[PDB]
Design a protein around this nucleic acid. Structure first.
Lengths: 99, 100, 151, 114, 127, 79, 206
RNA sequence: CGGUCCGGCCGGGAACUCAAAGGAGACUGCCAGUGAUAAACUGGAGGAAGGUGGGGAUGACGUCAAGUCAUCAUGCCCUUACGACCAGGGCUACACACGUGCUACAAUGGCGCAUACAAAGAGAAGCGACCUCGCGAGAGCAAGCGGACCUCAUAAAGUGCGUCGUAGUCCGGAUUGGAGUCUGCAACUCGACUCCAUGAAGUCGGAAUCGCUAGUAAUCGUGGAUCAGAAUGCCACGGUG
């Protein structure tokens, strides 16, 4: 049918490297690649008190940005499927394979 | 927190996994269903014979490192102080100071 | 502004008449950022204050302002250990601002039903050289004439 | 005019005039006017006497009048004579429904006294 | 042909397509009077094609998202100015002097820690 | 203000009450279950309800049915 | 005044994270706790191995740990039996299969963690604090550091009233985010309480 | 541009909004004048932006033996108790005084009907649609959604029409009585919410005092953390202004 790949990471350079690796794996296999479409970034935020006792007015605001990429292959030759299903990507990147 | 407080939390988690996972879910199901035995389902009396610590509502989220019962964050499982300590040392992935 | 010399912000003209005076009047009458609520009041008051006289609207509003506009006011001063009141000459922009603010506070201190009616009556009184806005202008001029020695 | 609820309602919109009865709020007033067949925006004047008799016939279904005062007095008296927690809170003029007494009990305690 | 211009304000972004000749204005499949019941919002939208004499000389097709009444009206004004400069490019000086080519960058200031609002600080007691 | 799926009563107190009514008049019932609802079969018995330090004797009457036991044992001393 | 943590303020700017995995909310706290336990065990076991930094990354269904140490032969040992024993228990702590790499710290005199550890060890050996601080500063500066300052605090030399002392050489621009500032701390547990040591090492910008 | 149940919905298109990665752009760079021919300052052009463009993070040496031994770590005392387990109670008391807020005293408003325009977020022992039942809180059944897709989720001030007509009122909602819903072993002390009923003070606040310089104050809604349940607090978001 068709395979879409959802990539998640906290660093955007890492997710871009992973997406580049994926599109090279696919195009060098001879499949067609739709993407990579940059999906909106989900940035969680946290506000914590930096004092051990009181001092509520003293706080630090932290955040975690989750970067999203979507890669679609329209006709996934068996070559493409079993090529990408054994790709080696960075540790901080989460990859989903939907069929 | 004291050692006894952490031991209490551990025991409560264990009891909640043992009983309320299946038995108390069944009993509360019998209690909430309107179609079943509107007179003597007997489930209400059996729900109180179970240990109290088996109720998940009696668990208190404490920092996984210190046991602090206040300022907890479910995302990290730590209190605000230990969250900040780990964040500044670069031990929480992706977390950094925010500005906008 | 200890050192700050400051410019001027862009006030938009009135949608109905195209006057900056009426726009600032609506701004002064506005509360809680409800500009549409204040514009209806000002327009109803100007309409009601139009048929009475006969000189359209803008003209009636300016005639009402001419009687409330203060020429000279007193500025408190602490030099000789007591309340000095030096009568200073009012600038035209501050003149219009004071006139409009006085008319609004006088209309809000009235017993009529709606703010449109209160405004219409206050403006008609001002055109007739009476009311509480003209009263306040005469109070200010009186206080200036009393302290003319301190110019 | 006058209703089975002795009280005399003012001559104004029927939905609001019927509120003067002790025990009839806005919802019950609307329900009375609906079950009777009278519009809500009509004054008490312009109402025929046959229409006021109709309103009386409908308000007779509710316990809304010194009768209701009696039922409320009976409940508070039962609470006080029972000696329960709410009975004691009623005896001492203190808030009954868990409100704080450190500050802000001025409706039950009245004007403050040093 | 269509001359396009993108206008923006606080949270709004208007897509304005102008075409040669008529007095028609359509905002989001609605007329100007239907879309803007506030007369200031209509005066702001009509404002740029008044310095340049266009009564029934340009047809406007507008869509706008985000923001409120005034933000959307300012975004439409900005987009109309941009489309007019795309259409003639000699009207640049007039729309500059009027102040319409400037993007109003006034955004809502964020809420800060320890303050009740962007600048509103809590009530201070000394003694 | 508990749902309408039946009132609550602690089971130990329930069995104590049945044993007390089936065996005839007895001594006051010492209990800590201030949260139990007073049932009609408790009319006539005197339940000693804990209030924090003592067990306050509460002679149950028909007018008390529906209340919780702790409603008749004040926990705070104020003079 | 209180200063921002110089490491955390530069995370993503010029400083990398010590934990580089991705996880959702479900496994985030579990991974954090497991990383904490792994780092704790490794710091306790390799106390005499000059371990300066423990980087933890979690591939798909495993964990690999990189130990930055200035004594790699001690961590590895004869025929790697020691690092094998370390891996076999890191795998138990983390639950998933484990892998351990050893990264050498070529210049221990330029690592803030190792300098702080050296100073705290000297303080616990009853060595004069001024001497230790100046030796650390000199060793770091003669090895090409652009700047260094170390600071010790709390009952120095057994004093009844605590005191904070700091020595500074070169350039330490804590307000420049482009500045590569290596910062770490350590505590000396003495007979008179805790003495906290802080070290800043500046290694240039960009 | 074709088709259309008029719904970007479906062929399609890659233009535009937008998404998110890279780049450009602002430097007193240019012009004029002043100025020790210096640094700079005043104005102008151009430009989306002009003079550290707006906001944030960033807090020097030190001061207050300032706060925290109750996050944590750490250099006298207890130890069949100053340790540990349990049930109930208390932290929620109440003559009173203070700080910080919310709601008001109304007509720039209350109520009724109709209708318009956001942004930012959260969600798997979770968010939970549609439909049915209930006056309602909710209940039953049961999709979709680890989510630019599904759900929370109807923005509200606003606008149109009607009414109220200055009164302790169709303002105000306190308090109290009755009847319920949900969470939870369990709502008595001591939960939140709904319905019916009741309708305190309050008609703009003494001495005094606070915040705020522009998308700011003022006002209007929205979301999140903690959390089984329990926000008028906190943290954030946009509308009008």
């Amino acid at each position: 049918q068709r395979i879409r790949i959802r990539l998640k990471a906290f660093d955007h350079r890492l997710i871009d490297q992973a997406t580049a690796e994926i599109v090279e794996t696919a195009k060098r296999t001879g499949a067609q690649v739709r993407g990579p479409i940059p999906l909106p970034t989900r940035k969680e935020r946290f506000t914590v008190l930096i004092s051990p006792h009181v001092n509520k007015d003293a706080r630090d605001q932290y955040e975690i940005r989750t970067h999203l990429r979507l890669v679609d292959i329209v006709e996934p030759t068996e070559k493409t499927v079993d090529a990408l299903m054994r790709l080696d990507l960075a540790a901080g990147v989460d990859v989903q394979i939907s069929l | 927190a004291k050692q006894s407080m952490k031991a209490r939390e551990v025991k409560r988690v264990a009891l909640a996994d043992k009983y309320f996972a299946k038995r108390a879910e069944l009993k509360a199901i019998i209690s909430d269903v309107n179609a079943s035995d509107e007179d003597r389902w007997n489930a209400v009396l059996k729900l109180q014979t179970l240990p109290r610590d088996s109720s998940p509502s009696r668990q208190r989220n404490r920092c996984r490192q210190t046991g602090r019962p206040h300022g907890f964050l479910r995302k990290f499982g730590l209190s605000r102080i230990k969250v900040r300590e780990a964040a500044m040392r670069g031990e929480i992935p992706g977390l950094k100071k925010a500005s906008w | 502004p200890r050192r700050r010399v400051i410019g001027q912000r862009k006030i938009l003209p009135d949608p109905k008449f195209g006057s900056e005076l009426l726009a600032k009047f609506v701004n002064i009458l506005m509360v809680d950022g409800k500009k549409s609520t204040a514009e209806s009041i000002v327009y109803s008051a100007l309409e009601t204050l139009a048929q009475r006289s006969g000189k359209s609207e803008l003209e009636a509003f300016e005639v009402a302002l001419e009687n409330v506009r203060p020429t000279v006011e007193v500025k408190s001063r602490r030099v000789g250990g007591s309340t000095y009141q030096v009568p200073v000459e009012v600038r035209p922009v501050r003149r219009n601002a004071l006139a409009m603010r006085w008319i609004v506070e006088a209309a809000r201190k009235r017993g009529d039903k709606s703010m449109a009616l209160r405004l219409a009556n206050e403006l008609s009184d001002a055109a007739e050289n009476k009311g509480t806005a003209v009263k306040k202008r005469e109070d200010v001029h009186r206080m200036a004439e009393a302290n003319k020695a301190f110019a | 005019a006058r209703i089975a609820g002795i009280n005399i309602p003012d001559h104004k919109h029927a939905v609001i005039a019927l509120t003067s009865i002790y025990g009839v709020g806005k919802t019950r007033s609307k329900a009375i006017l609906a079950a009777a067949g009278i519009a809500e925006d009509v004054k008490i004047s312009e109402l025929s006497e046959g229409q006021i008799d109709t309103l009386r016939d409908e308000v007779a279904k509710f316990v809304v009048e010194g009768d209701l005062r009696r039922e409320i007095s009976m409940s508070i008296k039962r609470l006080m004579d029972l000696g329960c927690y709410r009975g004691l809170r009623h005896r001492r003029g203190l808030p009954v429904r868990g409100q704080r007494t450190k500050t802000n009990a001025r409706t039950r305690k009245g004007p403050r006294k040093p | 042909n269509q001359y396009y211009g993108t206008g923006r304000r606080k949270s709004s972004a208007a897509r304005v397509f102008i075409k040669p000749g008529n007095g028609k204005i359509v905002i989001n499949q609605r007329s100007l009077e239907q879309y803007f019941g506030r007369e200031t919002a209509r005066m702001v939208v009509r404002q740029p094609l008044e310095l340049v004499d266009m009564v029934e000389k340009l047809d406007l097709y507008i869509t706008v998202k985000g923001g409120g009444i005034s933000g959307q009206a300012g975004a439409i004004r900005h987009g109309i100015t941009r489309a007019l400069m795309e259409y003639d490019e000699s009207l640049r000086s007039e729309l500059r002097k009027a102040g319409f080519v400037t993007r109003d960058a006034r955004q809502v200031e964020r809420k800060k820690v320890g303050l009740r609002k962007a600048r509103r600080r809590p009530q201070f007691s000394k003694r | 203000r508990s749902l309408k799926k039946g009132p609550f009563i602690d089971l130990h107190l329930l069995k104590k009450v049945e044993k007390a009514v089936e065996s005839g008049d007895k001594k006051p019932l010492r209990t800590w279950s201030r949260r139990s609802t007073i049932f009609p079969n408790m009319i006539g018995l005197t339940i000693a309800v804990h209030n924090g330090r003592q067990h306050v004797p509460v002679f149950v009457t028909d007018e008390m049915v529906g209340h919780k036991l702790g409603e008749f044992a004040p926990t705070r001393t104020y003079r | 005044g209180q200063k921002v943590h110089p490491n955390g303020i530069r995370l993503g700017i010029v400083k990398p994270w010590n934990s580089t995995w991705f996880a959702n909310t479900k496994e985030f706290a579990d991974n954090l706790d497991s990383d904490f336990k792994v780092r704790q065990y490794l710091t306790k076991e390799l106390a005499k191995a000059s371990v300066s930094r423990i980087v933890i990354e979690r591939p798909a269904k495993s964990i690999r740990v990189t130990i930055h140490t200035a004594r790699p032969g001690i961590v590895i040992g004869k025929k790697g039996e020691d690092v094998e024993k370390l891996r076999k228990v890191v795998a138990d702590i983390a639950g998933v299969p484990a892998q351990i790499n050893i990264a050498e710290v070529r210049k221990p005199e330029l690592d803030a963690k190792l300098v702080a550890d050296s100073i705290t060890s000297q303080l616990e050996r009853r060595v004069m604090f001024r001497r230790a601080m100046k030796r650390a500063v000199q060793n770091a500066m003669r090895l090409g550091a652009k700047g260094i300052k170390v600071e010790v605090s709390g009952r120095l030399g057994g004093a009844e009233i605590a005191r904070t002392e700091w020595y500074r050489e070169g350039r330490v621009p804590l307000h420049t985010l482009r500045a590569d500032i290596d910062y770490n701390t350590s505590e000396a547990h003495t007979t008179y309480g805790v003495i906290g040591v802080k070290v800043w090492i500046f290694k240039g910008e960009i």
